[PDB]
Structures are given as C-alpha cells and as structure tokens.
Structure 1
C-alpha cells in the first residue's frame, strides 16, 4: 500500500490544547519548533504523526513532546504557510529540540517510527 498514515499520537493528543510557562520558539527551515523552558529532569517521549509514500517520508503533520505523566511540553510542526520539507529538515528540527530540552537535563527519546523513515536514504 503506497500511502500510509503513521500516528504515534491519538486524536485527542493531536488536537489537545497546551501551553508553555516559559516559551521558547525557533524556526528551523520550513518547521516551527516549540518547547517549555520551565521543564527539568524529566524523561521525554517524542510522538510523531506523519505520512509516508511508498517507503519514504512524505510529510510530518505534527510532533509533540510528552512527559511520562502525559503532559505536552514541546512540539514541532510545519510553518503556517505549510511548505514542502525533507527528511533532513526533520532530522534537523528533531536534533535542535533535543538540544533545547537537554539544557534542563531532561532525557529525550525520539519517535522510533519517524526516525525509521527520517534517517533513511536511497
């Protein structure tokens, strides 16, 4: 099947409202990165929702960052203009958020489903 939607998150998790106590935000190419500076010493799970064409990444719809208690503390997503992006853009945006969260000695686990596609080649 040549188009699949890979959904780390639930519906409720995709659309939930969240807020940063101490906002940090950055534009990496065609992607916006967000993280709450207030958060420290937490293990953090990256959950991604994205699409895939044949066996390669198509689009990242949304990635959110979760504490082990289910609280959202960060997010990556496409710029409101919704432009095209590469796996490399993504690899890069994920790296930059890992660095950001790691400042307050949080541990970050990437989405294994996304990384399986984003760290691919030809």
Structure 2
C-alpha cells in the first residue's frame, strides 16, 4: 500500500499543457520541460510525492504554475528509465528554477518541496 502527498489538485495534475517555445532537458532520470516564452511572472513549483511512514520518498510529478494558474513547466520521470535519487530531484529542480529565472520570473517552491529540500 502506497500513499501520495501533493500540493496539486487532481485537475492540476491531469491537465494537458504545452509550450509556446519549448525548452527540454534531462538531468538524472527526470524529464524537465519549460516554456521559454514565459517572462516576468511569479511562479510556484508544486509537487506530488510518494510517502512512507510520514517521510517523503519519491517525486511523482512536479509542475510550475503562474498566478493565472497556467502550467509553464514540468519535471516528470521517464517510464523507460530507472528510478531517481534525492540529488537527481534537487538537480532537476535547480535546472527548472534557473531556466525560469533567466527569463526574469520569480520562482518559489511549495511547502512540500521545502520539506524535501533538507529532510534526512
């Protein structure tokens, strides 16, 4: 029996999105996508993690949202690749944040990612 803790609504996680000006990268075992067309916005990163004994375990899905609620980036596992580590997640988030910040966006991370950043 697994469990999942997420910042996102079901609709936020299921919603289709695509990039005006796609930028993709792959760091670790994680696909990183973001829209290069997004500039001068406030963005929040929200995540869905699996959880074991109240401890965050594995990143399932991360999406970047503007204030209008639009999706502008995503970090997700590739099915055809093995599992990722904590440092793979932190590296991937750092790539997404740096990409967004290069277009003068202000990015903050959700409470759940804030706990994942340091948790033993």
Task: Return the TM-score normalized by structure 2.
Answer: 0.91
Deviation at 1:115, TM superposition (A): 2.7
Runs of 4+ in structure 1 deviating by more than 3 angstroms, as ranges, are none
Aligned length: 120
Whole-angstrom distance in 2 between the partners of 1:45 and 1:36: 14
Q: Which runs of 5+ in 1 are unaligned?
A: none
Q: Which runs of 5+ in 2 are unaligned?
A: none
Whole-angstrom distance in 2 between the partners of 1:70 and 1:82: 30
SS in 1 for 2:39: coil
Counterpart for residue 72 of structure 1: 71
Q: Deviations over 1:7-63 (max 9, x none)?
A: 111111111010100000000010000000000000000010111222433221110
Deviation at 1:114, TM superposition (A): 2.3
SS in 1 for 2:97: helix
Deviation at 1:82, TM superposition (A): 5.1
Whole-angstrom distance in 1 between the partners of 2:82 and 2:8: 22
Task: Return the TM-score normalized by structure 1.
Answer: 0.90
Contact 1:8/1:49 (8 A) holds in 2: yes
